[PDB]
Design an enzyme around this catalytic site. Sequence first.
Site, mmCIF file in Angstrom:
data_model
loop_
_atom_site.group_PDB
_atom_site.id
_atom_site.type_symbol
_atom_site.label_atom_id
_atom_site.label_comp_id
_atom_site.label_asym_id
_atom_site.label_seq_id
_atom_site.Cartn_x
_atom_site.Cartn_y
_atom_site.Cartn_z
ATOM 1 N N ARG A 230 0.483 -1.284 -0.480
ATOM 2 C CA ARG A 230 -0.047 0.076 0.000
ATOM 3 C C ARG A 230 1.082 1.409 -0.110
ATOM 4 O O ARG A 230 2.023 0.901 0.825
ATOM 5 C CB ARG A 230 -0.783 -0.038 1.132
ATOM 6 C CG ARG A 230 -2.109 -0.835 1.694
ATOM 7 C CD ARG A 230 -3.261 -0.551 0.050
ATOM 8 N NE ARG A 230 -3.805 -1.237 0.238
ATOM 9 C CZ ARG A 230 -4.867 -2.596 -0.434
ATOM 10 N NH1 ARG A 230 -3.159 -3.238 -1.339
ATOM 11 N NH2 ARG A 230 -5.110 -3.218 -0.475
ATOM 12 N N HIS A 278 -1.401 -0.270 -9.788
ATOM 13 C CA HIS A 278 -2.117 -1.772 -8.615
ATOM 14 C C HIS A 278 -2.775 -2.262 -9.890
ATOM 15 O O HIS A 278 -3.775 -2.067 -9.517
ATOM 16 C CB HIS A 278 -2.750 -0.011 -7.286
ATOM 17 C CG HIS A 278 -3.462 -1.092 -6.543
ATOM 18 N ND1 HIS A 278 -3.784 0.349 -5.754
ATOM 19 C CD2 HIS A 278 -3.059 -2.359 -6.366
ATOM 20 C CE1 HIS A 278 -3.981 -0.921 -4.308
ATOM 21 N NE2 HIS A 278 -3.434 -2.315 -5.088
HETATM 22 N N1 LIG Z 1 -0.367 -4.613 -5.332
HETATM 23 C C1 LIG Z 1 -1.350 -5.109 -5.204
HETATM 24 O O1 LIG Z 1 -1.920 -5.195 -6.756
HETATM 25 C C2 LIG Z 1 -1.784 -6.205 -4.173
HETATM 26 C C3 LIG Z 1 -1.728 -5.566 -2.896
HETATM 27 N N2 LIG Z 1 -2.084 -6.104 -1.796
HETATM 28 C C4 LIG Z 1 -1.294 -6.348 -0.355
HETATM 29 O O2 LIG Z 1 -0.232 -7.034 0.470
HETATM 30 C C5 LIG Z 1 -0.762 -6.794 1.554
HETATM 31 C C6 LIG Z 1 -0.266 -8.122 2.283
HETATM 32 O O3 LIG Z 1 -0.686 -9.525 2.098
HETATM 33 P P1 LIG Z 1 -0.721 -10.285 3.049
HETATM 34 O O4 LIG Z 1 0.645 -11.213 2.993
HETATM 35 O O5 LIG Z 1 -1.633 -11.268 2.571
HETATM 36 O O6 LIG Z 1 -0.585 -9.624 4.230
HETATM 37 P P2 LIG Z 1 -1.023 -10.860 6.229
HETATM 38 O O7 LIG Z 1 -1.872 -10.277 6.371
HETATM 39 O O8 LIG Z 1 -1.212 -12.233 5.201
HETATM 40 O O9 LIG Z 1 0.678 -10.740 6.186
HETATM 41 C C7 LIG Z 1 1.006 -9.617 6.808
HETATM 42 C C8 LIG Z 1 2.134 -9.348 7.081
HETATM 43 O O10 LIG Z 1 2.842 -8.314 7.240
HETATM 44 C C9 LIG Z 1 3.232 -8.255 8.768
HETATM 45 N N3 LIG Z 1 3.157 -7.173 9.658
HETATM 46 C C10 LIG Z 1 2.231 -6.499 9.737
HETATM 47 N N4 LIG Z 1 1.942 -5.525 10.582
HETATM 48 C C11 LIG Z 1 3.158 -5.405 10.707
HETATM 49 C C12 LIG Z 1 4.127 -4.076 11.532
HETATM 50 N N5 LIG Z 1 3.410 -3.147 12.599
HETATM 51 N N6 LIG Z 1 5.342 -4.833 12.106
HETATM 52 C C13 LIG Z 1 6.013 -5.740 11.475
HETATM 53 N N7 LIG Z 1 5.543 -6.607 10.556
HETATM 54 C C14 LIG Z 1 3.987 -6.376 10.703
HETATM 55 C C15 LIG Z 1 2.192 -9.480 9.763
HETATM 56 O O11 LIG Z 1 3.345 -10.473 10.653
HETATM 57 P P3 LIG Z 1 2.897 -10.994 11.489
HETATM 58 O O12 LIG Z 1 1.936 -12.239 11.686
HETATM 59 O O13 LIG Z 1 4.285 -11.065 12.766
HETATM 60 O O14 LIG Z 1 2.081 -9.915 12.922
HETATM 61 C C16 LIG Z 1 2.944 -10.554 8.304
HETATM 62 O O15 LIG Z 1 4.019 -11.106 8.244
HETATM 63 C C17 LIG Z 1 -2.455 -7.066 1.774
HETATM 64 O O16 LIG Z 1 -2.556 -6.220 3.048
HETATM 65 C C18 LIG Z 1 -1.964 -5.280 0.793
HETATM 66 O O17 LIG Z 1 -2.366 -4.385 1.176
HETATM 67 C C19 LIG Z 1 -2.060 -7.263 -1.911
HETATM 68 C C20 LIG Z 1 -2.285 -7.624 -3.110
HETATM 69 C C21 LIG Z 1 -2.363 -7.003 -4.028
#
Ligand SMILES: NC(=O)C1=CN([C@@H]2O[C@H](COP(=O)(O)OP(=O)(O)OC[C@H]3O[C@@H](n4cnc5c(N)ncnc54)[C@H](OP(=O)(O)O)[C@@H]3O)[C@@H](O)[C@H]2O)C=CC1
Lengths: 315, 314
Positions: A230, A278
Amino acid sequence: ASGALVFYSAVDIGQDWKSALQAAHPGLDVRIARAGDGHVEGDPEEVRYALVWKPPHGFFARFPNLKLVINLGAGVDALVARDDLPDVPVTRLSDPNMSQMMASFVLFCVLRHARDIPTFERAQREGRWHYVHPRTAAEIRVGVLGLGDLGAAAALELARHGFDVRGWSRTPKALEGVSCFHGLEALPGFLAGSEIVVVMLPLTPETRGLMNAERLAHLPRGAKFINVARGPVVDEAALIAALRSGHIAEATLDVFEVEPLPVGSPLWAMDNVLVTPHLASIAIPRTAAPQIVENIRRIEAGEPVLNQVDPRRGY
Amino acid sequence: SGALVFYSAVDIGQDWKSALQAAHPGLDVRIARAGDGHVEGDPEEVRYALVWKPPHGFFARFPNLKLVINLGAGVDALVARDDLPDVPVTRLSDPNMSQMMASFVLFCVLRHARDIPTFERAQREGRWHYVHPRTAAEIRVGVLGLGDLGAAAALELARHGFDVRGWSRTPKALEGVSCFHGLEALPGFLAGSEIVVVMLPLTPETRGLMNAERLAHLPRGAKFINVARGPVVDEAALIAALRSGHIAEATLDVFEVEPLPVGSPLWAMDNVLVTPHLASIAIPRTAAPQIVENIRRIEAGEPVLNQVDPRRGY
Ligand SMILES: NC(=O)C1=CN([C@@H]2O[C@H](COP(=O)(O)OP(=O)(O)OC[C@H]3O[C@@H](n4cnc5c(N)ncnc54)[C@H](OP(=O)(O)O)[C@@H]3O)[C@@H](O)[C@H]2O)C=CC1
Ligand SMILES: NC(=O)C1=CN([C@@H]2O[C@H](COP(=O)(O)OP(=O)(O)OC[C@H]3O[C@@H](n4cnc5c(N)ncnc54)[C@H](OP(=O)(O)O)[C@@H]3O)[C@@H](O)[C@H]2O)C=CC1
């Protein structure tokens, strides 16, 4: 004893989703809400599932027997910020096809930087043949911020190509063949070793503006910066300044603070920046539908749903 | 063991020498002088030659030569020589080189499959324009050549969900890849290839294979990738097919004449990506083990790895 699913999206073809859902669940009552105001025909009390993308304010309050919300993207930052979100399980789309598409796209981005492609493109525009000795993948450290469904899949794929891969998450994770870091205290060190960095974090209050001037300064000089997460995770003005000073050599950006990227943005004319509008990964009706109908089955059987979001955390 | 002689005007002899001596302590390595190939020491002690485009008559300096090793995966110039000695001729072909080539091909294919040149064109105009992405399963990708590099690339493409096909001279079975073989099957192979990757060695059979007629068998709007040898493609015919829109886009790492002449129409085409012949390379440290293993084998009377057929040219 299935109820009806309501569909809302101004940017997805309702009929394609309807056809795919009915193929996965014959006889499923699917109602396509009208783009703009969300008006839908039929008895709203029969609606138990809502598959949506940025529906109008108050949309969910139309359906008092809603048991399940499904966001049409992997991200849920706009959905969870809503004041009208009902107190039921909230899920997102997150299937192995989406995963693969994102992982392949990240691999493209990393390889493009790792193999010096922007240098050759610049040279090609000048009519200049200039050999640059290639580097092996093992020489290049690649860091992935976020190790979720998408982030872990991308990190694992990068590892298969011989990169020295590291990953960062909020809580500890073990991921075979990837150097895992966790927590805010470890972030400077994680970034310091990341020649190429890939942002795969959800947008939350903790991640908003995480990659500010200070965090960008922890990356090594000449780093290659990829954002497929994002836009507001990155301080865009700070990225621009770091690009201009040469601290960041190149970038690939699929997401931005304001989308579409305003015409006045300095990023457009930079030949060391690749802008994509995007679309790093998307859900496809035919391959997304099965998990949706499986969650319908689970909600009616009283089983926990797949791909549930935490509305408080925002992912 | 006898001595190894090294010749290359474009590779650092010391890096190769260091890596070889690490893999085989005490190996006598002699770096021949760039340009004329002059080398110090008794030439009768030289039994192995690791070379890239050495001067005419270079091999005749060494009457006890038992093994030739080309410093590339391609051997088209080496096998065309009139002074090539009648000993086993090998090429470098290690799994690290394989991986590098496979990753590079994947980059090329993904770049076309995800419409990147469209976004780059739009970016240059300051225009944000969404184009709905296609799944990999919708896109058919054809690989011409299924050798050490070609098969590895095809298998990698298959992992990413593409509908992958491959073409070779003789039948091959390759899990998850639609395999075609023989000249009679080539039109049909090409007809289904939305994206095509040239991974053929240059031989008399492959020289000018992708001529006007073969390019016309590709579907309109095809994406064309060449990471093999330039003369496998009729360059003028490719240019014409690009100009008529029959080929939508291309990625070209190799050309009929290298470097690509400044007058070539390909330079200024925004639907063509030019890279300066570097899709994959041997790295001394990871290439050395197979070289010293072939030294061991030649002295033990065992058959060598990665032997080429000088008559056929690969
Ligand atoms: N450009 C595009 O077209 C697309 C963009 N996206 C974006 O990609 C994002 C990621 O998707 P996805 O992998 O499935 O998300 P997930 O929800 O499965 O995983 C999120 C990851 O981020 C980590 N995380 C969250 N907050 C923090 C923080 N404050 N500090 C450190 N690590 C953090 C989590 O760690 P932990 O689990 O240990 O909490 C986890 O490893 C989506 O939310 C979306 O915004 C997705 C699809 C398409
Ligand atoms: N751009 C670059 O930087 C690089 C380019 N290369 C090039 O890549 C080429 C291919 O490498 P590699 O995979 O290791 O080669 P291999 O020798 O292992 O395999 C050659 C393949 O080509 C096929 N082939 C040869 N002649 C014909 C023909 N007339 N009709 C159909 N198929 C044919 C062979 O079929 P069959 O198996 O039946 O004999 C085989 O599958 C090299 O020769 C080199 O020129 C390599 C490395 C780097």
